[PDB]
Amino acid sequence: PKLLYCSNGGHFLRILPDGTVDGTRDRSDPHIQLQLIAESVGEVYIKSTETGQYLAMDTDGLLYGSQTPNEECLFLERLEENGYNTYISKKHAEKNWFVGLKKNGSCKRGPRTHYGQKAILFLPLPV
């Protein structure tokens, strides 16, 4: 597993058993342990190690935790000069919708994200 740390609000990406996606600052949270799994080079699923759920973004730009993988669960990974990664929705890449966390640790919605934001920067860390 890895943790995905957002420096915008200082939160680890979290997928809860009920499929809620948000952020917590607590390093010890069981639900922040993630597996980044390759499809093709630079394409990844982001999977909850605890629940088995996959991070996904819906057609309304909303993040949720999917019981099973689908086309909404693929993200295009990029590093990013300062060691942080970005994750753009594969399905909505043309809109530049990203995985992001607000300063208050709740998720960002696709249209409210874009290249250049701190919200979209995640640092993969060891558990």
Strand pairing of 122-126 and 21-24? unpaired
Q: 1-127 — its CATH code? A: 2.80.10.50
> CA-to-CA distance for 97 and 2, rounded, in angstroms?
23
**Residue ranges per structural domain of the chain:** 1-127
Q: Which two tokens stand for residue 42?
A: 């630079």
> CA-to-CA distance for 110 and 30, rounded, in angstroms?
26
Is 8 annotated in a binding site? The answer is yes
User: Which residues, 6+ apart, have CB-to-CB distance to 109 below 8 Å?
Assistant: 60, 61, 62, 63
Are 6 and 23 contacting, i.e. CB atoms less than 8 angstroms apart? yes
> CA-to-CA distance for 109 and 41, rounded, in angstroms?
26
CA dist 68 → 65, 73, 115, 117, 120 (Å): 9, 9, 29, 30, 24
| 8-state DSSP, 93 | G
**Sign of the CA dihedral running 126, 4, 119, 40:** positive
> CA-to-CA distance for 126 and 92, rounded, in angstroms?
29
Q: Is 12 exposed, middle or buried (0-12, 13-18, 19+ CB in 10 A)?
A: buried
